[PDB]
C-alpha cells in the first residue's frame, strides 16, 4: 500500500487509472467547482485499447438549449446496454460536485455523488448513492469528459495504485 | 474576507465494520495564486463497531 493509514492521494493526471482490482473500502474521487458548457460526463473504462464500462451524464438546468426532457437530470449509461435516469443531486453546471466511487463487496461498483450550490456554499453538500449497474474488474479507469471543469481534482485511496507518470494520460512530467 | 480554499465538509459516512472508522469529504474551491490549497479534503475518524 501507499500509506500506513487510509488517505486520499491526489493523482496528477487527467484520469485515474487504477492498477489491479478495486478493493472494498478503497475509493477513487473526482471533484470540481463546476463546469463551463455542455454536459458533465463521469466515465468508467476497462481494458479491451480500452472500452467504456459505465458513464453518468448530467445536464445543466441553467444552460440555454438543453432539451426540457434532459435539463437538470442525470443519466446512467452502461456498456451499450441501456441508458436510464438516476436520482442525483447535480442540477447545474454552476454547482460544485464530487464523485466518490468504490466497490461495496468486491463485485458491485457504486458511487456517492455530491453537489453543492455555489450561491449557498455554507449549506453544504447533498449526496446520493447510485449503483453503476456494472461489476468491478481489473485495471478500471475513472475520469471526466466536460467543457471547462473548474478546479478539477482527482484522488485514489492509498490502498490503491494509480498511474501517475504516463504523459498519455495527462500526467504532469 | 479570508475565503476558505476548500468547500465545507460533507457528512460522515456510515461506520465501516469491523475496522471501526468512518470518512467524510470536502473539495477544493480554489488554489491560491502562490500555492495550492492546503486544507484537507478527506478525513477519517474511529467509530464504534
Author numbering:
A (entry chain A): 44 to 91, 98 to 128, 135 to 228
B (entry chain B): 596 to 644
Paper excerpt:
Microneme protein 2 (MIC2) and MIC2-associated protein (M2AP) play crucial roles in the gliding motility and host cell invasion of Toxoplasma gondii. Complex formation between MIC2 and M2AP is required for maturation and transport from the microneme to the parasite surface. MIC2 contains a von Willebrand factor type A (VWA) domain and six tandem thrombospondin type 1 repeat (TSR) domains in its ectodomain. In this study, we report crystal structures of M2AP alone and in complex with TSR6.
The TSR6–M2AP complex structure was solved using the M2AP crystal structure as a search template, and the TSR6 domain was manually built. Like other TSR domains, TSR6 in the complex has three parallel strands, with a stack of aromatic and basic residues forming π-cation bonds on the layered side, although the number of stacked residues in the layer is lesser in TSR6 than in typical TSR domains. Notably, a presumably layered residue, Tyr-602, adopts a conformation out of the layer, and a water molecule is positioned within the layer and hydrogen bonds to TSR6 residues Thr-601 and Pro-635. The complex structure reveals that the rod-like TSR6 domain binds through its non-layered side onto the hydrophobic face of the M2AP β-domain. The TSR6–M2AP interface buries a total of 1460 Å2 of accessible surface area. At the center of the binding interface, Lys-72 of M2AP forms a hydrogen bond interaction with both His-620 and the main-chains of Ala-621 and Thr-636. The His-620 of TSR6 additionally forms extensive hydrophobic interactions with M2AP residues Met-70, Met-153, Val-155, and Phe-169. At one edge of the interface, Trp-180 of M2AP inserts into a valley contributed by TSR6 ribbon residues Tyr-602 through Ser-605 and hydrogen bonds to the main-chain of Val-603. Remarkably, the H620A mutant decreased binding by >5000-fold, showing that His-620 is a hotspot in the binding interface. Furthermore, there is an attenuated peak at −61.50 ppm in the spectra of the complex, which can be assigned to a small population of layered state for either free TSR6 or in complex with M2AP, because the layered state of tfmF602 shares identical environment with or without M2AP. These NMR findings support the notion that Tyr-602 undergoes conformational equilibration between two states, and that binding to M2AP shifts the equilibrium towards the flipped-out state in which the Tyr-602 participates in the interface.
